[PDB]
Symmetry: C2
């Protein structure tokens, strides 16, 4: 009967912004005013229309007109610095465009969607507008009017400037169906979202009373404007309406996308329809048959029986003739068949706000969104009693003149919203409340795993650990960022701030816009948060504050080192307390068990594994395996939070991990590589001992210089070029032990490595045949990331290049030197300044630091991930905070996953101060 | 790959209207200009902008500006009488609204869709507009500006006034995406048609250069306007553009509806898309990435591989920077992968017309529609050579600078149309030619049927019959109707008229608007048509011309009589030459064979059946059956052409047919009724003879008066009250033969009926039991039509009343008198003036005529259907013409069914003169 014939989705309303008479600038302010029954119509303000009141003819004509209405408080103000407009351009921009920009910002903030996250996305903008009032001000003097007025007053620019400033790529159109323009814009946004063509829709309408021309015209018509300026909707003393200025906006998404993204659904749009009067009894006469038809069309589109409607937000313009016609059409469709005791409730926000001609629909939609979200029906005002020409009982309608509950005739709250243009264009939108249905749809290692969780629980019971919460603050300017920090600190010190959980404060901040000037405060409690924010408000450096004036130019470089980074309990704390990290550790552990026939997970969880000779069966082999597993898991944890390397570089065991993150090999293939060499190096060491051993040592000699010294020590080779002034060499002990003295002659640094791996030297000649045999079957792929190979003499390989990770590549890299310091320098020449080391302990960062300074870079960003004697969970948060502050890819929202899935959370977010604007006066000097 | 993901229909373009510079006012004029490469940019006309050129400051500023452009010839003219606007209202209406009204009329006429047939239908209107130039003229003097300017210059009224004047009920919206507004409007119309929500879409755009303000602003910007005013699209000497005024419109339907309705499909819209630049390098800078994305989106929506495009109608504004950007995006999407020898052809109508800012898309769409329909590509002009900053060969593009053929790379012609707004809103529409695939998907009676067709063929061979063709002419005023007739007559006398088949002239006229003042000329050849039209041009009454100044108030009354209407060959000629009539005769013939065991079709086809005693086995019975069959078939033939009775009335055998057309019984049930009585009356007559017979006679005595005479003739009864002063009585012959002398005493008229049916009298008492037995099982239904029962004492039964056609109703009607003259009078009191007799011969119309005059109605419309000694096919055409001229329901298009189904007809329509408008000067007196 009334079921949908087409297969479409419901549309969720996720955010609302308002700028309405009576100083209603937020949804909460509007809701309080509606509950109180506030009358927002006032006298014409003294400082308005002054460009016309110095001419006595116009002045006397205006004094004779009604002129009471809904006026805004500060129409000339505008934050032109925030929206990046020069003084002259700002002076020429219509207030309607200003309101479009501001309302878009406020609506996105209310929806808890960061504006930065929508840049480049398919966001449609649909705004209703009916009057180019500001153009008349510019046209006062045709000769001297500035050409900026052309773009500053064109109707299309109302939508186009919003699309331009926010970098929206969806459809962008201004629509005019004069008095129902907002509802028509909403209808177009809904249709767009249903057809694809847009993933988010910004819909609304604006209106401004810049000049008295339209008001004087309507006054000259006669019998249109109420003598006292009050709209008495459906009342017995109804005698016309009054004009009002303002605007509103809504943010719309498909309900499935809203559920997936975790948006709070305020209300649901089930359907809508638009039509026209046709040939009515005059162009300006409303047609009841057409209104009935638009009602029927809308409820068929929504798939809802009109008998079930609880509330109608009416056109309600308070004309003695229009109100009975609207009531008659409603009685034909909405009221038909109802019992006398279940009437549809009726009201009109125009009785509060006046007639917001092209923004009237936006005001109505905002009222109904707030009524559904807050589960109350606000009164309609100026109601002295029923219009005698309307049989309310027979039409099955009742005017709601108090605060009342939703009847919920069908079990859920349903409402309809009507708007009729004075040219005959009609619209109706059907809404319903959000429902619950909308929001839905190793053996021995196991022993050690339990023994670790129990001991952590027992340790926790004795003393709880204070969780680290990162607090993000940002703006388009450093000065604005500092001001926001100061205001945030006061609210946190406030009683309402102290009553909010620190995690909820962090979650709210994480859903705000992430601008170009960024800072993060790492806080364990409120008092620490206050201290850090106050320090940020000044220029005072604080150890708990990460900050930067702007982003760096290029992306980060991931450094896959790992020699000498092992220690007793590496990775264990992070494995227990982070699910993503544990998942990838298990994944790598499965692969190694196949290839090597044991589990690395047991070594990680066991506390007596010192990764030395006295506690591990094969120390040389397993240490490389565990470090590789940790490197894979740390990198995947970073990917989970939205980080991605711009380029990669490895060193002597991290090549396997570097190969994986560059896209060269798959995880299995990279696992096969490291598994093969580690056990081959381990096997070789036992075969040779006594005099056959080759030691590894570090010296203070450069690469070019080393060519001279090797003339008289032929046996020695170079393993890795670590720093410009440091190198690692290997060879016979007598030719090696001597060189320590050869260095001590000139007071240089030199020390011996106490490990018997002896890689990149002679010992690996016997191994190369087996390595090729074991690696026979790996499938190199073209690189998806920049790659600074330390095997191919430090060269830079661009993304998308031909595959390079062949068998001979691993054969070569295992045997010959590592060109690490060369690789770093090449990276610095391409403009990289951020270097991120994935390791259990940062040892390669110092080597990277020396190279960067040697290349003329003393402010390089050197970010560690894990470190001995530092809490592993805190280290990862700090690393991700540093990436974020310097503008690198990082989704701060993923740091605050939602605990509550349903509608009963209500505490996931704190009521942090909104973004503050600095409004300056911008207006055209004009005289008539 | 490029196949549609959504299931949608293609959209057909069925009509085009144009108002473009260079006096291009019809699609044919525009096509000729395009083939000739006409340059339509001129100097500013002398009589334009004069309201500003009397102030020396403005005058000097304007003289310094470029000001060459595409200007209309007569912008102040308007036929305000045609569009029903007063002088003061017309003076205040923006030329954009005027153009919207006129272009809608011209587009519907070009589509051969009568405007009257769309009144009340779901017709959507979508019009692009970007400037309220006329408002500035009204705002010159704020005090004395008339309030009519409010509705006369609002943007929304551009669409709303069209919807109002034509009685369209679909969506009605004005859109502004400044320079691509027309394409965006087209996109919205396509989306509407695909979603339902509209069955016809009127889409287009308008623009007017009322004042110099915008031109002077763009001139003051600098580097925007071409110094010589010529748009040199993609040329090496491109230096800006010039502004132009005008408008265009298209009529759109779903392709299935166009095929079903027999519209000529000019071209097909396969898909379209709209998006925005986002944050480009400045608000006014075009973004190549966004343009590429809109291209990809549009071709995905169309389900077409962009590699197959033959022609791109470009934005092409001739800027030295914009043209390479457009070419670059095209090369990214349209050109990619093509071989060097199959480039996409490129052009721009802006090189012909200038820049028609919000109507530019309409001009582009019109050009491509005509190019596809006429199978040619017109040149792009002002092309001195390729822009050196565009590598045309590499982009796989070629500028089309001559007249050329469609390459048809994929086997069919495909084109794309682009438009980019200066605020960053982009649009692309994909078109293709119409394809052939779019336009697809009793035994003895048989002996007599063949013998009749052969004899008709033989008769035809000796002399052909000149077919009667009805020619419809109408207007909103009688004076305009006469003028149209005079102009039509001249064109028919013209050599081109004489070369057109008279049927094609009639078909074209039948597809024109059917206004309130109507006339039909019944013509067998051109010369007769000319003579009738000339007579209509004056007030001269002519026997071949039916005419009326306006419609009558109420619908027609169908009169189902039939006693005494039989004759030798009734129905035979119409049965052979009309398929619909034959089909229903066969249907009734099947029913009667079941009930009565013989075929009436044999009697109709046989020529020796005189319906008398010497030639029919049962004359009394079969005559009623044949007349009933003819009455059913004639009424169904009228229904096929769109006629429907407002009320029905029967008489003494037509009650059965009257019952059927009122909706009381089904055809089977009504057939059972008449079959039962006819054979019962026939059986009764043989049973009684000699002295038992009762005769029927007619006298000149009224109903009230008859009560006196019956005092001394107790046996006599009254059968039917025919006229106020005439009655039919029946009874014993001696009491009946006497009364003829009783009447002759006072010189009154009286005659005897020579038939032995003797109905509505004593003889039917024995029959009533069997009649109820035979009729036991009929299912009366509530009436769907007004009904003046002559059984229930002439009463009027309203439609929707309770069922009345029970068994006792037939029992009663068969026995008691027929209140016919009473029934007619009741009809006249409800305001009926048209009475239509369904009979083989009009005998009841004279009785109806006498009653209507007696009730004070001397201009009643008394329409016969068939008549003895008149050609049956001509009689039916004349009857339907009379219904049409008086405004009754009749679809004149059904009188001219199409012969050719495919694309090769090309002769179904004649090139009759278009509707002529009388333009008067309407403008605002204004001074600055």
């Amino acid at each position: 009967d009334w079921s949908r014939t087409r297969d479409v989705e419901d549309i969720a309303i996720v955010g609302v912004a308002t700028r309405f008479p009576g100083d209603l600038n937020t949804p909460d302010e509007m809701w309080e005013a509606l509950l109180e029954g506030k009358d927002c119509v006032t006298d014409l303000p003294e400082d308005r229309w002054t460009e016309f009141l110095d001419e006595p003819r116009i002045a006397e004509r205006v004094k004779k007109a009604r002129t009471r209405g809904g006026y805004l408080t500060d129409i000339k103000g505008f934050d032109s610095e925030f929206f990046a407009l020069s003084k002259m351009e700002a002076d020429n921009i219509d207030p309607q465009q200003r309101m479009a920009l501001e309302l878009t910002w406020e609506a996105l903030e209310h929806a808890r969607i960061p504006a930065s996250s929508l840049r480049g996305e398919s966001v449609g903008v649909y705004i209703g507008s009916s009057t180019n009032d500001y153009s008349f001000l510019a046209m006062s003097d045709p000769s001297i009017a500035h050409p900026y007025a052309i773009t500053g007053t064109a109707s299309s620019i109302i939508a186009n400037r919003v699309s331009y400033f926010y970098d929206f790529r969806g459809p962008s159109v201004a629509v005019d169906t004069a008095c129902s323009s907002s509802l028509v814009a909403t209808h177009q946004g809904v249709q767009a979202l249903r057809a694809g063509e847009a993933d988010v829709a910004i819909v609304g309408g604006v209106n401004a009373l810049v000049t008295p021309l339209v008001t004087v015209g309507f006054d000259e018509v006669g019998g249109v404007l109420a003598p006292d300026g009050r709209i008495k909707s459906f009342s017995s003393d109804a005698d016309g309406y009054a004009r009002s200025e303002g605007g509103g906006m809504l943010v719309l998404k498909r309900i499935s996308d809203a559920r997936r993204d975790g948006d709070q659904i305020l209300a649901v749009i089930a359907g809508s329809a638009v039509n026209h009067d046709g040939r009515s009894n005059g162009l300006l006469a409303p047609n009841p048959d057409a209104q009935a038809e638009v009602l029927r069309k809308a409820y068929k589109d929504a798939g809802i029986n009109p008998r079930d409607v609880d509330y109608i937000e009416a056109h309600g313009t308070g004309t003695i003739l229009g109100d009975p016609i609207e009531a008659d059409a409603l009685g034909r469709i909405v009221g038909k068949g109802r019992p006398a005791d279940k009437p549809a409730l009726l009201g009109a926000v125009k009785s509060n706000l006046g007639h917001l001609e092209s923004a009237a629909g936006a005001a109505s939609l905002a009222k109904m969104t707030l009524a559904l979200a807050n589960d109350k029906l606000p009164p309609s005002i100026n109601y002295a009693g029923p219009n005698p020409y309307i049989d309310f009982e027979k039409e099955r309608l009742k005017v709601n003149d108090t605060v009342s509950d939703w009847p919920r005739y069908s079990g859920k709250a349903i409402a309809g919203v009507s708007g009729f243009g004075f040219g005959g264009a009609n619209a109706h939108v059907v809404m319903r409340e959000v429902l619950a249905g909308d929001l839905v749809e190793t053996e021995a290692a196991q022993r050690l795993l339990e023994q670790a969780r129990e001991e952590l629980e027992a340790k926790e019971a004795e003393e709880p650990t204070k969780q680290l919460v990162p607090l993000a603050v940002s703006a388009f300017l450093t000065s604005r960022k500092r001001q926001a920090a100061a205001e945030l600190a006061d609210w946190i010190d406030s009683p309402e701030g102290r009553a909010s959980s620190l995690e909820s404060i962090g979650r709210s901040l994480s859903r705000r816009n992430h601008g170009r000037s960024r800072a993060v405060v790492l806080a364990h409690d409120h008092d620490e948060a206050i201290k850090g924010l106050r320090a940020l408000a000044e220029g005072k450096q604080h150890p708990s504050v990460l900050s930067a004036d702007g982003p760096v130019t290029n992306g980060p470089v991931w450094v896959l080192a790992g020699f000498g980074a092992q220690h007793r309990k590496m990775g264990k704390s992070l494995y227990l307390r982070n699910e993503v990290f544990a998942e990838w550790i298990n994944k790598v552990d499965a692969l190694i068990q196949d290839e090597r026939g044991y589990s690395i997970l047991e070594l990680i969880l066991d506390d007596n594994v010192d990764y030395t000779d006295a506690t591990c069966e094969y120390p040389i082999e397993v240490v490389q395996l565990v470090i590789f597993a940790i490197q894979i898991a740390l990198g995947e944890l970073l990917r989970h939070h939205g980080a991605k390397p711009a380029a990669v570089v490895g060193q002597s065991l991290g090549e396997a991990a570097a190969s994986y993150f560059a896209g060269g090999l798959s995880l299995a293939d990279a696992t096969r590589t490291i598994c093969s060499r580690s056990h081959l190096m381990g096997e070789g060491e036992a075969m040779l001992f006594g005099e056959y051993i080759r030691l590894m040592a570090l010296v203070e000699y450069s690469a070019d210089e080393i060519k001279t010294v090797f003339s008289d020590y032929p046996d020695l080779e170079v393993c890795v070029y670590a720093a410009p002034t440091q190198t690692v060499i290997g060879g016979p002990p007598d030719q090696v032990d001597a060189i320590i003295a050869r260095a001590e002659s000139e007071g240089k640094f030199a020390r011996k490595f106490q490990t018997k791996g002896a890689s990149h030297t002679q010992q690996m000649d016997p191994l190369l045949g087996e390595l090729a045999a074991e690696l026979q079957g790996i499938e190199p792929k073209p690189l998806t990331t920049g790659y600074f190979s330390t095997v191919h003499e430090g060269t830079f390989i661009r993304p998308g290049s031909a595959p390079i990770h062949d068998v001979d590549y691993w054969k070569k890299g295992l045997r010959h030197s590592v060109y690490f310091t060369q690789g770093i320098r090449n990276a610095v020449d391409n403009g990289h300044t951020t270097f991120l080391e994935l390791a259990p302990n940062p040892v390669a960062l110092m080597q990277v630091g020396l190279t960067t300074a040697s290349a003329g870079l003393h402010d390089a960003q050197l970010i560690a991930t894990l470190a001995r004697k530092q809490d592993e969970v805190e280290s990862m948060i700090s690393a991700m905070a540093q990436l974020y502050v310097h503008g690198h890819d990082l989704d701060f929202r993923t740091l605050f996953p939602r605990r509550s899935k349903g509608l009963a959370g209500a505490l996931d977010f704190a009521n942090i101060p909104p973004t503050r604007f600095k409004r300056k006066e911008h207006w055209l000097p004009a005289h008539f």
